């Protein structure tokens, strides 16, 4: 945990809990899988907290450290940059994970709501123009789930855009109110359109 | 730095079949090696450390060979639950480096796409901008070719793509193609056009609509 979005420059300081094993016996890692699934090394800690091993990417910037008694995992990243934007995991010494994750995202952008515009067999939704990507779209509730289709948002300049298509039965379309369910929960937004005929 | 050359980046494969992935140092790296499996989001597993040595628990089918320059992970025979990606990394040297990866993916029949395009909502156009959506849905041989064509002369600017990991209950893929106008800029022509070609057909499937029925 400690993620987010923050804007360039930024500090943030990600938190890692362990348990089933003993924490002070290992050597702790942090480690970062970049948007585009690149893998990358952050930092290293040795099992007392002695030595700290650093790439270059973020030598100086980043500060991993822990505290063998509460069994806490910290990394401090400061001066942050766009390339840091990844999801960052912890793992106990080759590797062994046991992290599940926690998305850091570093942007100068604004948080902003999405429009949402019907596309009227198939139908579909148009998410368009929202920031911080979480989105989510089910239609009719999520009742109706089988023959949806939710495709990687892909960010035109400074926000994202993404559709998703529904393929429901023909008897069943005009005859049944058939909605799309789209959710920002980064400004608390939910919007519901009806996909109408003509 | 040691840059870890995998391949190849993607491999079909049918279940049963057994697979051979490459993960080549730029340098003596030696028996530090060590591979992971990544299925859809899942942090990464370890599956064999050092080279050859696997994890216990990790199955059979599974194992690992090479030193200095070369190492292969083998799958005598793949089980659905293998695909996903595979990373290599080492442990010798300067910064700890990893691969790019492999995506196993899985083998199937030819698939047709099954294609629609869907003209501005009504909506979009009161805002000044003309989406025109086009979706290719369900189809199998990933390599798709989408082109679009405003009253049949083809545009490739502002077009906005998109695709979807292998569907876990089909195996097909599916994409959403997305040429951007302004509504001044779309009211202009008459029909639009989504072509696309693909390995199940010789002609292209096409769809189209024009601004006034």
């Known amino acids: 945990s400690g993620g987010g979005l923050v804007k360039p420059a930024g500090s943030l300081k990600l938190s890692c809990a362990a348990s089933?094993?003993?924490?002070?016996?290992?050597?702790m890692y942090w480690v970062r899988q970049t948007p585009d699934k690149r893998l990358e090394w952050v930092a290293t800690?040795?099992?007392?907290?002695?030595?700290?091993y650093y790439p270059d990417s973020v030598k100086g910037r980043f500060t991993i450290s822990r505290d063998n008694a509460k069994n806490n995992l910290y990394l401090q990243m400061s001066s942050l940059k766009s390339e840091d934007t990844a999801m960052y995991y912890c793992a106990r010494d080759a590797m062994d994970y046991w992290g599940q994750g926690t998305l850091v995202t570093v942007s100068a952008a604004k948080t902003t709501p999405p429009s949402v515009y019907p596309l009227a067999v198939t139908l579909g939704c148009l998410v368009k123009g929202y920031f911080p990507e979480p989105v989510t779209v089910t239609w009719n509730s999520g009742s109706l789930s089988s023959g949806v289709h939710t495709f990687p948002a892909v960010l035109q300049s400074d926000l994202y855009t993404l559709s998703s298509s529904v393929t429901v039965t023909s008897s069943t379309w005009p005859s049944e109110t058939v909605t799309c369910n789209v959710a920002h929960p980064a400004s608390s937004t939910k919007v519901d359109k009806k996909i109408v005929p003509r | 730095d040691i840059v870890l050359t995998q391949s190849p980046a993607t491999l079909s494969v049918t279940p049963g079949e057994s697979v051979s992935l490459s993960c080549r140092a730029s340098?003596?790296?030696?028996?530090?090696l060590h591979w992971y499996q990544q299925k859809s989001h899942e942090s990464p597993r370890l599956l064999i450390k050092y080279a050859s040595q696997s994890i216990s628990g990790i199955p059979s089918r599974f194992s690992g060979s090479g030193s200095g320059t070369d190492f292969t992970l083998s799958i005598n025979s793949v089980e659905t639950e293998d695909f996903g990606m595979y990373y290599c990394?080492?442990?010798?040297?300067?910064?700890?480096?990893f691969g790019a990866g492999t995506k196993l993916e899985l083998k199937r029949a030819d698939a047709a796409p099954t294609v629609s395009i869907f003209p501005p909502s009504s909506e979009q156009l009161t805002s000044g901008g003309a989406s025109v959506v086009c979706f290719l849905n369900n189809f199998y041989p990933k390599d798709i070719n989408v082109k679009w064509k405003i009253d049949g002369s083809e545009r490739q600017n502002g077009v906005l793509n998109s695709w979807t990991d292998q569907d876990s209950k089909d195996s097909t893929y599916s994409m959403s193609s997305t040429l951007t106008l302004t509504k001044d800029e779309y009211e202009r022509h008459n029909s639009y056009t989504c072509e696309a070609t693909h390995k199940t057909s010789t002609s292209p499937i096409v769809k189209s609509f024009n601004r006034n029925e």
């Open positions: 990394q080492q442990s010798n040297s300067w910064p700890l480096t």
């Open positions: 340098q003596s790296i030696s028996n530090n």
């Open positions: 089933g094993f003993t924490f002070s016996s290992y050597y």
């Open positions: 800690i040795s099992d007392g907290g002695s030595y700290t």
